[PDB]
Amino acid sequence: RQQLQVLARYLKMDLDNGERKFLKEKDTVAELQAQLDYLNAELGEFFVN
Amino acid sequence: EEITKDHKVLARQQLQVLARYLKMDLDNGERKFLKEKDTVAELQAQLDYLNAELGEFFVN
Amino acid sequence: EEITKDHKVLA
16 A cells, blocks of 8 residues: 555546545535425425425 | 656555565664664773773883 | 656656
8 A cells, every 4th residue: 555655646537536525415415305395495305396 | 757656656655555464574684783872882982991090101 | 858757767
């Protein structure tokens, strides 16, 4: 693992970039789901569907 | 010489990783040497004091 | 930059 880290640093490759982007995207998903849940609570399932 | 320096840096980091895996202290020798040099300075100060008190003719 | 690229490929 330490040798892999040394190589990754030499190559300037961020091994955690994908996870960072994924966590941001998951926050966005939660935001949009909260908005949709609010509209469903205001209007009801029958109306929305 | 950016490319050569970057490669030597990578080599140094790989050497450090290996040294840590092997539990080999690369600075042990220098540490011991600096302690020994302090001891040499102490003994030389004592000898210099005796030479200042007694003089070269007497000591020799 | 053939040498640097070849080394980065090896890495």
